[PDB]
């Protein structure tokens, strides 16, 4: 029973240590054999983190005239294909760490089935 956000990011780092080699060879450009390495390792650092993350705060007025502060989140992982699609969850245990995770997970989920828009949550 390991942490989850480590699991997802754990796969990406693992799956990038595999494709990295067969991917340098299939590049076309006027570079060295080492400038390509610095080009692949580099793009793979750009795909990994989450571009945008927001954080909100609401003045809601309860039914009994009271007030309280609701607190939300939304993370858009990638912008490479627009829009971004991602569900909304209502739960008292929605951290900002698990929103980054599930957002990144959809950018790859909706890529294996060739659905254009990127990931969010």
């Amino acid at each position: 029973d390991p942490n989850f956000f480590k699991m997802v990011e754990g796969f990406f780092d693992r799956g990038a240590s595999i494709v990295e080699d067969k991917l340098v060879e299939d590049l076309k450009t006027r570079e060295t054999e080492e400038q390509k390495r610095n080009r692949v390792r580099s793009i793979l650092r750009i795909i990994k983190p989450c571009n945008h993350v927001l954080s909100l705060s609401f003045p809601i007025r309860r039914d009994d005239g009271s007030w309280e502060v609701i607190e939300g989140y939304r993370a858009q992982h990638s912008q490479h294909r627009t829009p971004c699609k991602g569900g909304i969850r209502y739960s008292t245990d929605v951290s900002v760490d698990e929103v980054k995770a599930l957002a990144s997970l959809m950018t790859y989920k909706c890529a294996v089935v060739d659905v254009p828009f990127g990931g969010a949550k």
Partner: protein, 125 residues
């Protein structure tokens, strides 16, 4: 520098420097006041023939010839920083805070930021 940052935002938002349309206008109005004091006296003491050369001071002249935008800024600042102290002095009495000023600073802020949520209907429902 927050106050002057507010003045720069207005300068960039009026699309004209400060006073460009008024410096030479307010300059003439000063010399016509002096020439008015001169004439008015020389209608009473004037039969004696003595001229009365009413003229600006050597400092008030150094204020007319070099009147620029820089003066209006260093003025609107000295007016903010003064109108605002009188409100901290006051609050330091309305709550009997003595020589605790820091608390009176935050008390003014909260008491003004409160009057904006209250008279607005915070909820859009």
């Amino acid at each position: 520098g927050v106050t002057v940052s507010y003045f720069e935002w207005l300068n960039n938002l009026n699309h004209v420097s400060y006073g460009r349309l008024t410096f030479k206008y307010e300059r003439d109005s000063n010399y016509h006041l002096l020439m008015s004091v001169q004439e008015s006296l020389e209608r009473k003491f004037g039969k004696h023939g003595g001229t009365i050369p009413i003229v600006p001071t050597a400092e008030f002249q150094d204020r007319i010839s070099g009147a620029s935008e820089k003066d209006i800024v260093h003025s609107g600042l000295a007016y903010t920083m003064e109108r605002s102290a009188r409100q901290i002095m006051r609050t330091a009495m309305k709550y009997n805070l003595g020589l605790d000023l820091r608390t009176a600073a935050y008390v003014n802020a909260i008491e003004k930021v409160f009057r904006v949520y209250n008279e607005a209907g915070v909820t859009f429902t």
